[PDB]
Amino acid sequence: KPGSLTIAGSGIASIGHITLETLALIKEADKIFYAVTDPATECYIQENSRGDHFDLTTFYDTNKKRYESYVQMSEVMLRDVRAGRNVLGIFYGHPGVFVAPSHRAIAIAREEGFQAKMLPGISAEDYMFADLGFDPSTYGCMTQEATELLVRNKKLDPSIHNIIWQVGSVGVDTMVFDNGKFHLLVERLEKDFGLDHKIQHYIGAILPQSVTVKDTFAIRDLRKEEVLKQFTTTSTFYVPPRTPAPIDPKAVQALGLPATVTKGAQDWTGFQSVSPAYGPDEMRAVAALDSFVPSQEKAVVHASRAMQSLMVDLALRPALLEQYKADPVAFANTRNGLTAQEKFALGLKKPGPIFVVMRQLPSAIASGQEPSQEEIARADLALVVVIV
Ligand X SMILES: Nc1ncnc2c1ncn2[C@@H]1O[C@H](CSCC[C@H](N)C(=O)O)[C@@H](O)[C@H]1O
Is 70 assigned a catalytic role? yes
| Separation between Cα atoms, residue 388 and residue 382, nearest integer Å | 17
Query: Which of ligand X, a copy of itself, none has residue 202 at its interface (CB below 5 to 8 Å by kind)?
Result: ligand X
| Separation between Cα atoms, residue 307 and residue 331, nearest integer Å | 12
Q: Which is nearer to a copy of itself, 195 or 388 (CB)?
A: 388
Q: Which of 34, 44, 92, 127 is catalytic?
A: 92
Binding mask 222-241 for a copy of itself (x = CB under 8 A): ----------xxx-------
- Of residues 245-274, which lie at the interface with a copy of itself (CB under 8 A)? 245-248, 250-252, 254-258, 261, 264-268
Query: Which of a copy of itself, ligand X, none has residue 195 at its interface (CB below 5 to 8 Å by kind)?
Result: none
Minimum distance from residue 121 beta carbon to ligand X (Å): 7
33, 77, 86, 94: residue in contact with a copy of itself (rule CB under 8 A): 94
Is 278 assigned a catalytic role? no
Q: Give 159's contacts (C-beta < 8 A, 6+ positions apart).
A: 139, 241, 242, 243, 244, 245
Minimum distance from residue 357 beta carbon to a copy of itself (Å): 9
CB 40 within 8 Å of CB 332: no
Task: Fill in the amino acid letter for 129.
Answer: F
| Separation between Cα atoms, residue 200 and residue 236, nearest integer Å | 8
Q: Which is nearer to ligand X, 84 or 133 (CB)?
A: 133
Minimum distance from residue 276 beta carbon to a copy of itself (Å): 10
Q: Which is nearer to a copy of itself, 29 or 97 (CB)?
A: 97
- How many Å from the N-terminal Cα to the C-terminal Cα in the chain? 52
Minimum distance from residue 317 beta carbon to a copy of itself (Å): 10
Q: Which is nearer to ligand X, 131 or 342 (CB)?
A: 131
| Separation between Cα atoms, residue 158 and residue 138, nearest integer Å | 14
| Residue ranges in contact with ligand X by CB under 6 A | 12, 91-94, 97-99, 123-124, 165-166, 202-204, 206, 233-234, 236, 383-385
User: What values do phi and psi take at 31, rounded to 5?
Assistant: -145, 140
Q: HEC states along 212-265? A: CEEEEEEHHHHHCHHHHCCCCCCCEEEECCCCCCCCCHHHHHHHCCCCCCCCCC
**Which among 194, 167, 208, 157 is positioned nearest to 13, based on CA atoms?**
208
CB 222 within 8 Å of CB 239: no
- Of residues 124-153, which lie at the interface with a copy of itself (CB under 8 A)? 126-127, 129-131, 133-145, 147-153
Q: DSSP alpha helices (H): ranges in 60-214?
A: 66-82, 100-111, 124-132, 146-151, 182-193
Q: How would you class 82 by CB atoms within 10 Å of its CB: exposed for 0-12, middle for 13-18, buried for 19 or more?
A: middle
Residue 196 CA, distance from chain mean position:
32
Minimum distance from residue 78 beta carbon to a copy of itself (Å): 9
CB 128 within 8 Å of CB 163: yes
Task: Fill in the amino acid letter for 332.
Answer: A
Binding mask 285-314 for a copy of itself (x = CB under 8 A): xx-xx--x-xxx-x-xx-x----x--xx-x
| Separation between Cα atoms, residue 19 and residue 126, nearest integer Å | 14
Query: Which of ligand X, a copy of itself, none has residue 268 at its interface (CB below 5 to 8 Å by kind)?
Result: a copy of itself
Query: Which of ligand X, a copy of itself, none has residue 1 at its interface (CB below 5 to 8 Å by kind)?
Result: none
Residues touching a copy of itself: how many (CB under 8 A)?
171
Q: Which is nearer to ligand X, 366 or 384 (CB)?
A: 384
Q: Is residue 365 a contact point for a copy of itself (CB under 8 A)?
A: no
| Separation between Cα atoms, residue 352 and residue 152, nearest integer Å | 46
Q: Which of 34, 70, 139, 238 is catalytic?
A: 70
Q: Is residue 368 a contact point for a copy of itself (CB under 8 A)?
A: no
Q: Is residue 107 a contact point for a copy of itself (CB under 8 A)?
A: yes
Is 378 assigned a catalytic role? no
- Of residues 171-210, which lie at the interface with a copy of itself (CB under 8 A)? 171, 173, 175, 180-181, 184, 206-210
| Separation between Cα atoms, residue 125 and residue 94, nearest integer Å | 10
Q: Which single residue brings its beta carbon nearest to ligand X?
A: 93
Which residues are catalytically annotated? 66, 70, 92
